[PDB]
Structure 1
Amino acid sequence: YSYTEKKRIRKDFGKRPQVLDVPYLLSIQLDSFQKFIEQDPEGQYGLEAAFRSVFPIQSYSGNSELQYVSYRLGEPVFDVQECQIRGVTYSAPLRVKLRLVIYEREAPEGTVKDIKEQEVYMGEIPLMTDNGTFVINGTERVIVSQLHRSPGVFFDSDKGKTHSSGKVLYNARIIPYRGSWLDFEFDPKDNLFVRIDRRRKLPATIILRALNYTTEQILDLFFEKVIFEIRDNKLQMELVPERLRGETASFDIEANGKVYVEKGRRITARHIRQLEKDDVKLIEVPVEYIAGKVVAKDYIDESTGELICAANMELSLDLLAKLSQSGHKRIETLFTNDLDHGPYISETLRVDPTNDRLSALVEIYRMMRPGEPPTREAAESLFENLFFSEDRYDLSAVGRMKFNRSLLREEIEGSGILSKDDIIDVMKKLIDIRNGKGEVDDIDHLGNRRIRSVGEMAENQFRVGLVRVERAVKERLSLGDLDTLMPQDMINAKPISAAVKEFFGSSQLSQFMDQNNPLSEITHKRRISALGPGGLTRERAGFEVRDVHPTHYGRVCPIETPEGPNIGLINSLSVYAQTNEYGFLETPYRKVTDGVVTDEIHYLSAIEEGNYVIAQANSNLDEEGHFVEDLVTCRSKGESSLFSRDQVDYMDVSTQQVVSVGASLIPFLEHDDANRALMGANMQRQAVPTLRADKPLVGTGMERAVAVDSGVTAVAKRGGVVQYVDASRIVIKVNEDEMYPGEAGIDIYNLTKYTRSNQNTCINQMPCVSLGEPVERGDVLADGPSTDLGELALGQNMRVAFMPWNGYNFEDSILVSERVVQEDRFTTIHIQELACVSRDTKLGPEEITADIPNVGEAALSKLDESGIVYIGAEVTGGDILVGKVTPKGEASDVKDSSLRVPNGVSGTVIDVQVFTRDGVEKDKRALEIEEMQLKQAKKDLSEELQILEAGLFSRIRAVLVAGGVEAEKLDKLPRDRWLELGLTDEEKQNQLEQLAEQYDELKHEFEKKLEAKRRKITQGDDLAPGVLKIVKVYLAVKRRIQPGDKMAGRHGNKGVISKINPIEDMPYDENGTPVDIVLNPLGVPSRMNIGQILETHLGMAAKGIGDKINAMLKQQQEVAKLREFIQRAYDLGADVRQKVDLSTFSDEEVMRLAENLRKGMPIATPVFDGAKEAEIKELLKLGDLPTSGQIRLYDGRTGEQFERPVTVGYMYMLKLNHLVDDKMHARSTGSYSLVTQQPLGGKAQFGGQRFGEMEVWALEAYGAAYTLQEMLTVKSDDVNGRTKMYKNIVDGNHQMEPGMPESFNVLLKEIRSLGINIELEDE
């Protein structure tokens, strides 16, 4: 086991052996941005791709080409921590190599001049932190992945609402990544219409006309021919028997001398077999049959030249006679089977008004730009650039792969531009499905829904910047002269960097980190949003989209989603899932070799999963990968059933892979209704870090993975031994094995103490380890917020009893004992930030001095001479945080603009920061802050130098001992007196000058490094135009739990703390221990969350064991007893994958482990492979507790016994962020709004309640006329009315003076101001 694991082992239930370990949970973000930067030769995904896409930039036929070589990411100027402190964006400079080449002009082009630009600076790109986030202005932002429809072609149905007469009208949509959209739809009359991206629907054939296809060519390509030969007389037809499928006979079908099908009887299978075996090709047919068909080609009279029938014209006897007399032996008619093969392109051609290519292009042009006369070449160029221009129309590699796969073409790699064969095949498939030989696609299939992560969106935005700047360079290179200018006045970085920072900063998917819980961080980073750019808007989207598709299995969490209005549009990603090479979603599966379940894992996407039969994870395997049952339970096409042993292709990796991290943290998920599990997870992500987090008594084992993988813990990078421990830094001496040979030194981890998180919570790290303990690579040195010894401890575990106690827990409300507040276990620290900004006005700059007009010295007492509060001073609402004066001109004094503490907030000033970009004057506080940072830098550098210096001196002593041993005199004189000493002239003297010069070089490197650090510290941190300086002040406030606050469990049970009872009143067991929480039973039966009951039982068992060992340990019997007891406990049955034992060191580690477990041994029930009841019963028995898990309790107030014993035990509860002191609010009178004199809205400013129209109706239902009267005039809007009412109340009388509202009188004057006579009548 690891060292932190050996510290406190967690008793793990769970039967199936974990084959795959949980991957790095933040893989998505880091891997995507790595792919984004990813210096690579062959243009694959990556910035490189964008450059090669946009370059080469050739002049407007000016023969001055621009070429791209390569780019380089500059080293960031600001590290992460200092960047947060100083309020700048953490970024790297981007530099690109270009060449300008000028060839022969008015001559065959030949390279005349080539100039190389000196590594042009092309702007700043923000870098991503180690944890996978972005610091954009000293605020931690996250870029959520976006789920959206993949490029390609989709055949939709859109039925039901089509004219309410059935008539299912199909449609094919071609969507590219970049370029216009193509749409083919039908009409009630089965005519197939095309609609350019989002316009009206035109007949499709016009586009076919634009592609240069003649009507006969089209009818050739689409319709099945029917041949009519005339041999010596009367119209004999060449017939393929198999064409007759499903056709009532219209004529008498005689053949070879024998009538086969009588005229009128539909051809039966008997006749079909007869005719087939007879081998009948041609049959003479009556002229009435042909008197109805349609002609395919445009048969002209070859002899004379006169046209007779046109392409797709109905046949009449006269036309048949003309054709027969003209001498046409071979006739090609159309096959119109009114059942299967319809005349769709024919009828579209009939409705199609355009005839020539030119008329089609004219109509097209008149569609895009209606009203301006279309010129031929304009239409030609438009159509060319529409779908076949490499630059404007590009689908993708992914778009093209999906496109070819949808139409069943073997070739995966295509051209970006839309080729003609693509469109023709698409139309063929559309008409095919229209006949019914095909299925429509379902949008909700994850095989049709692709995930765009950060790097892809950043790449797109950067490309946009590039296309802009390319146009710019193009024009400047065209107009301006060619050879005078060098390639840096010409290219401007400002708009590109502007676009990148707008995207990263001001975007829908780029949002503030939800930073109060480690779980909150980890779940926020692994999120998939369907909104944003190219994302569905919430209101129009249908219920069908927000349902859970069977494809989501093992890819997205079914249970974790906000329960607000956008439920189902968020869908947090599952544990084990990954992104494909093309941005699809894949999940791991174990291969199945016919009998044995092997150990190699393959990642499968949605489509591949669809085909196979996948076995469940909870299937019993004995020692060689064979299923115990003959018929096992699997799923094949999204539906589960029984399959045979020797049919399963794959098997689920583990039971946990269905659910997200949040859901995986809930114990006994298998016993909770899905609704309450959903709400439980959603709430559990809101828990606030307490003062000392401890641990869950009932966990799932995932706590350490979450804590480590989040960046809140401090984790060792190179293993070694802890040299120095302080409550600010941990300094570790590396082990010699891993110790780098040249210029290694030791490792130092600086910790972070109370700082403000996004949610105003405290972020503090505590050291775990002590002096002299050995640490290995990857152990947890320091605990972050709300984590203990590596484990996630969101809340705390307390002793609950399920009973109604005089209706104080009537509804879901909760009763709590005074011991919890006395022992201070639910008290949190919060942290507000306040900012005072001194800008430069045109009347004169404001000042920060402490000299503030007409303020009493009481207010100054807590201010220093510079005008900033002392660190540690206690302030209250309304106190002056800092002193500022606004200058007055045309005097500067007599008025104060000093910032004050907001009303009703009181805490201690823990920190102050000052930012003066100008650097004018500087200030006292800047000097103190600079010295605090500087002294630290000095200490660290001094420590490193002294270690390296001690080493150099040891080597100097080892050389000095050679060549004449001198050990008496040397060791007692100071060490600095060893360089001035001498030795016999030899190579040894050469070594002494060498070592002296290396000592000097270490000094000089030290001095320059120090100078550099001091230059970085001193420089002004670039502020916005007009602001001289800014001072930020952090207040910290300790909030204790009180009645009205909200508390919850992990299973969805909620409540408001209703009353704090004295300890004596609370129920107590015979032993005298009072319970902590009194929980309502009536929440169980209707809210079928049974997981809390099992959790309570198992928690009592675990705390019982912990109590027994604490009791046995306080008496300190002997090591032997402890080892025996702990072993018997840890074994507890069989089938467990634990395997612990006493192999660990014999005395120290056991004593430490007992000390840590004495507070209760932590259990680990996995989600679905959990602890069954019998095991809980056994564990309760081992502790000497009632097996039924309920005990008899005596009422602490009255003393009589309760009938029917009650369930008690320990449950892990959380205090949610809904804290009563923020919610409570009241106003009598206060500030009103400027334009409409209504009271301000909000809590910061006093603010009134919104008396809506529904409340008006409620009051109107009663006869409450006077209440409404005051509500409309006296309470809000009437100025004179409100002051008169105030004065009347002050006078001690409670009346009012009625009349017409003045606003109404204003109305009279405004309406009267028109030519309208409106009079106030009287009687």
Structure 2
Amino acid sequence: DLIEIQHASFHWFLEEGLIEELNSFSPISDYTGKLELHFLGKDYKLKQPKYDVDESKRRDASYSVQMYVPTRLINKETGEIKEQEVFIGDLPLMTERGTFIINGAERVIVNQIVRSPGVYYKKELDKNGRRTYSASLIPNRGAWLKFETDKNGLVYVRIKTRKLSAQVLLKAIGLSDNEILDSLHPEFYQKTLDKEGNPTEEEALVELYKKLRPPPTVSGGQQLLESRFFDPKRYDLGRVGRYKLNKKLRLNEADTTRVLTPQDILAAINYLINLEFDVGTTDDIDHLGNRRVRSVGELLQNQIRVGLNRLERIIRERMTVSESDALTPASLVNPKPLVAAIKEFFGSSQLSQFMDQTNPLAELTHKRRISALGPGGLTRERAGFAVRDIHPSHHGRICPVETPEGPNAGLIGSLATCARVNDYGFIETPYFRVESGRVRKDLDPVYLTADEEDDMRVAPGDIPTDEEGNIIGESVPIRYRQEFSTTSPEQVDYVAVSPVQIISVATSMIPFLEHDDANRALMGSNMQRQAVPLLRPERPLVGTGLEAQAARDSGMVIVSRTHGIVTYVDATEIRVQPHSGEEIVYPIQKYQRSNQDTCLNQRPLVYAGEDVVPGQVLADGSATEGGELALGQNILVAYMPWEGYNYEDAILISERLVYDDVYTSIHIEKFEIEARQTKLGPEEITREIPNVGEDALRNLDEHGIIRIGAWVESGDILVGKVTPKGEADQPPEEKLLRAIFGEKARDVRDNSLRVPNGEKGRVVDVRVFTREKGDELPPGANMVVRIYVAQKRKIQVGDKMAGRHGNKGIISRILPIEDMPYLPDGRPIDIALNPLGVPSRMNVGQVFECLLGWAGENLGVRFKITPFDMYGEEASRDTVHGLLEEASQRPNKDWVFNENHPGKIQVFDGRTGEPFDRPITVGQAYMLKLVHLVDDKIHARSTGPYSLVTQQPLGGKAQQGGQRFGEMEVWALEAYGAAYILQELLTVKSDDMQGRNEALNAIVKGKSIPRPGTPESFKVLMRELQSLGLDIAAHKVQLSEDGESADAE
């Protein structure tokens, strides 16, 4: 299973994470001691949800459950036990795909990588001086212990504040002079004991309080130090903090997990002194053995911990004011601070991200992202060069290729294919045991938790092995202590289980990965997660074979579980019968809206009367073919330059891709309107709207709302809504115009929902959610109407297409089939790609892919080639050229392979009919269609809305915004002679309530006027500087007159 960091994490929270939080919260007491409240956390209910999975997405709700615990309220003096179940909070459940539904939108919880708790030592040179060793005891939650060591044998303890001597903390926790020196070399400790005095057990708590809290008190020094490291519910090492203390310092005690042991502070000082004696290891901060990951089971444990602490303040403020008895325990627990704590984590936190649902490849990748940012991780400004590079401990755990380019280059990683996280939070990799030069591929792997660095010798999965005898190679390259070396095959210990263990699940879909560059393989893995689901997908011919596993783990593929006989198959359900209440129904969704405006259509695959197996595809998804995944189409390609139509990364396609419904996707948009409550009068949805005739009232059913199946275009009316007005401030021009022809204006105003510019399609869902029907509504709303419009988009000029090797491009021309070049059998060419971008970017694998897919086209065999071989030069060139020779041995196909030029044939011109001078490489390429279509990039504005303060035009496609003329754009016009264009762009086009009126009136009348006025943004800055206490004004230097000018008035 590829999703185990989400399913096993939420399963741990429902049985171990929720029980541990309620056991530490209980019991609580009052100020006097009259009654006590303790919970029973291990007997909670977790009742049934309210709505369905598909119903919660359209009703704008969350798939959540109610949490109830039994609560026993006892009293100290009077014997009474009050058992009652009290509501705790709303907990959203994880769906079957591993996601959550928050406010009708599907969301994921990205796993965040942080540092592991423990002690870490570091050699630091602050200046050109001696060698200083530092320390840092990091807990899971609480204060930090930073031990430093200066020159001349002075070890200090810093607990944010100023540093202090090591004897001050070591004596205040409770110790003797003989219990320190017996377990310490004590000759180095005499230099820090001379210039520190010699305090007793009570002569150190007073001096500790004088420097931390600057009167000292004998009772104040004990309450300050115990609350930092020794008090419960304020300092936590964690289950993994106790494990890292017993490994580094080699401690004998274990299973403490709550209180910091004072013997552990003595062991951290002893390891720091011995670092000057050239013994001990300096820890690394970028090592994956020191870096942990956490998931939904751990991140939810911190939100209930800060949510129950707010509940502890109200539970102690209600058992003291009410001095009377006979009170119910259900009124002591207020669920309001804990409901708002869970709702803030799932909807308002940064780590809960919007789920990418373009294709099943992006859904599987987004659940396995390893990001180093979040509330407790790193910062965008605090990220440096060392944290973004690849550590040598990332071999097989984190993918070195798949990472987003730009700002987050290296901070957001991806988990590898065979990687696995244990219960402690460390990434593990499987390895096969090698015994005396023989790979023992018979038993289960070892799953080493990054402990193979300083102990084991690990070989990758690329060495030639024999059939159970020995290893063929005499020099095996291995890795030992983060360095590569070639040793004997009898000296190795472990070997990798797969050659795709290093790369992730999205990089493994690229065939011939070893022939492509690592920079273009980064782009090829990112463009595969943006491919739209087509209308009829097609499986690739040069697939790697891992597409079948990624389709079943995405959750959008109906699988069988019963091993039965299929009875009834239609377009909505599949009914089988289980055998060794026997009729289950598998529902099939038809054209459901996704998050990225794509389709989630499922098609039936099986027929009636067929034996099935557990793990068989019953119904494939939208971007999924039969069994395996399918994100694009296999069509003909040719690497030849046309007449400037493929000049700089441009694509020339044919007309055959248009009328054959190739690269044709279905996009479903969703519109929203609401009949709110205006204080002047309630708004309602009517059909008789003013100033709109029969040109737009054709699809309404006398209710103001459109019908199902009506073709809407740009500028129509979906929901006709009116709004009452109470202005009554008519100008004298409109009063004279209305008095002539009559037709007195009504009190309503047309606020109908309309279709935006460049939008069309067919309406498929006109679901209306009103009150008194069984659904909750937001306050200040009478009727909520939701309109879903689906449209069928073909492939056009301006769309961005790409392949699996980073050869992205934008189509500039769609030629007919008689103008495209044609093969010597008469078959035309679909895509005419440019061969100039190939040798400059090292995209060699895309030439191996098309030449192998052309061999699979004439044979019809659908090759499955795994990456990272076999014999050198005999597995990539002679595989392609050897299989192209077999396709040429057919009696009908003799023109496929040539002896002089192997990977080339003769191509004829379509316009003139003459052959070209040189042979051209042809093949069957697998191209994808990305989400960056030409329809979403069109924006234009003449005059629209304006800003609130600066009175400048707004910015945005969805709100009719204007393009920003920034500071780099002024410097280009200032370097030109364009002074009148610069004054026009800053005055009459932005921030002038007077200059915009006269400039617009000049074009309609036909006589332009010069000299625009003062812009509004300068007068805002003039009033802001006067409010800062600065007498700033503008004057005139005219003859015998120095007067201030009034820019505002």
TM, length-normalised to structure 1: 0.73
| Corresponding residue number in structure 1 for 2:170 | 208
Measured after TM superposition, the shift of residue 1311 of structure 1 is 8.6
- For 1:125, give the aligned amino acid: L
* SS of residue paired to 2:396: coil
* SS of residue paired to 2:319: helix
| Corresponding residue number in structure 1 for 2:951 | 1237
- For 2:555, give the aligned amino acid: G
* SS of residue paired to 2:304: helix
Structure 2 distance, partners of 1:1302, 1:912, is 45
Structure 2 distance, partners of 1:59, 1:606, is 49
Measured after TM superposition, the shift of residue 1306 of structure 1 is 8.6
Structure 1 distance, partners of 2:68, 2:1024, is 65
Task: Say whether the 8 Å CA contact 2:657–2:795 is kept in structure 1.
Answer: no
Q: 2:604 aligns with which of 740, 751, 767?
A: 767
Structure 1 distance, partners of 2:13, 2:1026, is 68
Structure 1 residues 1246 and 84, CA gap change in structure 2 (3 angstroms) = closer
Structure 1 residue 1176 corresponds to structure 2 residue 880: yes
| Corresponding residue number in structure 1 for 2:579 | 736
| Corresponding residue number in structure 2 for 1:652 | 496
Q: 2:750 aligns with which of 882, 892, 896?
A: 896
Structure 1 residues 1310 and 521, CA gap change in structure 2 (3 angstroms) = closer
Measured after TM superposition, the shift of residue 1263 of structure 1 is 2.6
Structure 1 distance, partners of 2:1022, 2:173, is 69
Alignment of 1:871-950 (within 5 A): 871-888=708-725, 893-916=747-770, 918-919=771-772
Task: Say whether the 8 Å CA contact 1:795–1:1214 is kept in structure 2.
Answer: yes
* SS of residue paired to 2:45: strand
| Corresponding residue number in structure 2 for 1:453 | 295
| Corresponding residue number in structure 2 for 1:192 | 155
Structure 1 distance, partners of 2:503, 2:167, is 51
- For 1:592, give the aligned amino acid: V
- For 2:686, give the aligned amino acid: T
Task: Say whether the 8 Å CA contact 1:192–1:348 is kept in structure 2.
Answer: no
Q: 1:1186 aligns with which of 897, 901, 908?
A: 897
Q: 1:573 aligns with which of 409, 412, 415?
A: 415
Structure 1 residues 1319 and 359, CA gap change in structure 2 (3 angstroms) = farther
Cα deviation 1:269-295 (Å, max 9, x = unaligned): xxxxxxxxxxxxxxxxxxxxxxxxxxx
* SS of residue paired to 1:450: strand
Task: Say whether the 8 Å CA contact 1:400–1:416 is kept in structure 2.
Answer: no
Unaligned ranges ≥5, structure 2: 728-744, 889-895, 1040-1049
Shifted more, 95-104 versus 45-54: the winner is 95-104
Task: Say whether the 8 Å CA contact 2:419–2:428 is kept in structure 1.
Answer: yes
Cα deviation 1:1081-1138 (Å, max 9, x = unaligned): 11111101200000010011011113xxxxxxxxxxxxxxxxxxxxxxxxxxxxxxxx
* SS of residue paired to 1:859: coil
Question: Which protein, 1 or 2, shows the higher relative CO under an 8 Å CA cutoff with sep ≥ 6?
Answer: 1
| Corresponding residue number in structure 2 for 1:237 | none
Structure 1 residues 217 and 772, CA gap change in structure 2 (3 angstroms) = closer
| Corresponding residue number in structure 2 for 1:438 | 280
Cα deviation 1:162-188 (Å, max 9, x = unaligned): 23x154432111111121111122446
Measured after TM superposition, the shift of residue 359 of structure 1 is 6.7
Measured after TM superposition, the shift of residue 62 of structure 1 is 0.8
Structure 1 distance, partners of 2:701, 2:1031, is 68
Structure 2 distance, partners of 1:1310, 1:86, is 46
Q: 1:349 aligns with which of 175, 196, 209?
A: 196
Q: 2:823 aligns with which of 1063, 1069, 1075?
A: 1069
- Structure having the higher helix fraction is 1
Shifted more, 532-541 versus 513-522: the winner is 532-541
Structure 1 residue 1208 corresponds to structure 2 residue 922: yes
| Corresponding residue number in structure 2 for 1:261 | none
| Corresponding residue number in structure 1 for 2:734 | none
Structure 2 distance, partners of 1:132, 1:1311, is 54
Task: Say whether the 8 Å CA contact 2:663–2:929 is kept in structure 1.
Answer: yes
| Corresponding residue number in structure 2 for 1:463 | 305
- For 1:1095, give the aligned amino acid: E
Alignment of 1:613-632 (within 5 A): 613-624=457-468, 626-632=470-476
- For 2:754, give the aligned amino acid: R
Measured after TM superposition, the shift of residue 1305 of structure 1 is 7.9
Aligned residues: 1002
Structure 2 distance, partners of 1:858, 1:806, is 47
Structure 1 residue 1078 corresponds to structure 2 residue 832: yes
Task: Say whether the 8 Å CA contact 1:205–1:348 is kept in structure 2.
Answer: no
| Corresponding residue number in structure 2 for 1:1029 | 783
| Corresponding residue number in structure 2 for 1:145 | 111
- For 2:157, give the aligned amino acid: V
Structure 1 residues 646 and 864, CA gap change in structure 2 (3 angstroms) = same
| Corresponding residue number in structure 2 for 1:683 | 527
- For 1:191, give the aligned amino acid: L
Shifted more, 182-191 versus 1065-1074: the winner is 182-191
Structure 1 distance, partners of 2:990, 2:195, is 67
Structure 1 distance, partners of 2:705, 2:552, is 39
Q: 2:867 aligns with which of 1163, 1167, 1180?
A: 1167
Structure 2 distance, partners of 1:1311, 1:68, is 59
TM, length-normalised to structure 2: 0.91
Task: Say whether the 8 Å CA contact 1:589–1:653 is kept in structure 2.
Answer: yes
Structure 2 distance, partners of 1:1240, 1:913, is 33
Q: 2:983 aligns with which of 1241, 1265, 1269?
A: 1269
- For 2:158, give the aligned amino acid: R
* SS of residue paired to 2:141: coil
Alignment of 1:232-271 (within 5 A): none
Structure 1 distance, partners of 2:1025, 2:568, is 84
| Corresponding residue number in structure 1 for 2:733 | none
| Corresponding residue number in structure 2 for 1:85 | 58
Task: Say whether the 8 Å CA contact 2:950–2:1016 is kept in structure 1.
Answer: no
Structure 1 residues 36 and 1209, CA gap change in structure 2 (3 angstroms) = same
Q: 1:1321 aligns with which of 1009, 1025, 1037?
A: 1037
Structure 1 residues 1217 and 1304, CA gap change in structure 2 (3 angstroms) = closer
| Corresponding residue number in structure 1 for 2:736 | none
Q: CA RMSD of the aligned region, Å? A: 2.6
| Corresponding residue number in structure 2 for 1:845 | 682
| Corresponding residue number in structure 1 for 2:854 | 1100
Structure 2 distance, partners of 1:540, 1:1289, is 53
Structure 1 residues 746 and 892, CA gap change in structure 2 (3 angstroms) = farther
Structure 1 distance, partners of 2:814, 2:472, is 56
Structure 1 residues 626 and 114, CA gap change in structure 2 (3 angstroms) = farther
Structure 2 distance, partners of 1:517, 1:1252, is 37
Structure 1 residues 828 and 415, CA gap change in structure 2 (3 angstroms) = closer
Q: 1:803 aligns with which of 619, 626, 640?
A: 640
Q: Highest Rg: 1 or 2?
A: 1
Task: Say whether the 8 Å CA contact 1:142–1:525 is kept in structure 2.
Answer: yes
- Identity over aligned pairs, percent: 55
| Corresponding residue number in structure 1 for 2:892 | none
Structure 1 residue 832 corresponds to structure 2 residue 669: yes
Structure 1 residues 124 and 1231, CA gap change in structure 2 (3 angstroms) = closer
| Corresponding residue number in structure 2 for 1:713 | 557
Structure 1 distance, partners of 2:1025, 2:845, is 68
Task: Say whether the 8 Å CA contact 2:637–2:833 is kept in structure 1.
Answer: yes
| Corresponding residue number in structure 1 for 2:380 | 538
Measured after TM superposition, the shift of residue 1295 of structure 1 is 5.5
Measured after TM superposition, the shift of residue 535 of structure 1 is 0.7
- For 1:1055, give the aligned amino acid: G
| Corresponding residue number in structure 2 for 1:182 | 145
Measured after TM superposition, the shift of residue 609 of structure 1 is 5.1
Structure 1 residues 1316 and 880, CA gap change in structure 2 (3 angstroms) = closer
Structure 1 residues 1318 and 703, CA gap change in structure 2 (3 angstroms) = closer
Shifted more, 544-553 versus 64-73: the winner is 64-73
Measured after TM superposition, the shift of residue 584 of structure 1 is 1.3
Measured after TM superposition, the shift of residue 1270 of structure 1 is 1.4
Structure 1 residues 1315 and 683, CA gap change in structure 2 (3 angstroms) = closer
Task: Say whether the 8 Å CA contact 2:709–2:764 is kept in structure 1.
Answer: yes
Q: 1:1278 aligns with which of 980, 986, 992?
A: 992
Structure 1 residue 48 corresponds to structure 2 residue 19: yes
Task: Say whether the 8 Å CA contact 1:728–1:752 is kept in structure 2.
Answer: yes
Measured after TM superposition, the shift of residue 635 of structure 1 is 1.8
Cα deviation 1:284-307 (Å, max 9, x = unaligned): xxxxxxxxxxxxxxxxxxxxxxxx
Measured after TM superposition, the shift of residue 1062 of structure 1 is 2.2
- For 2:50, give the aligned amino acid: V
Structure 2 distance, partners of 1:1315, 1:531, is 46
Structure 1 distance, partners of 2:476, 2:800, is 46
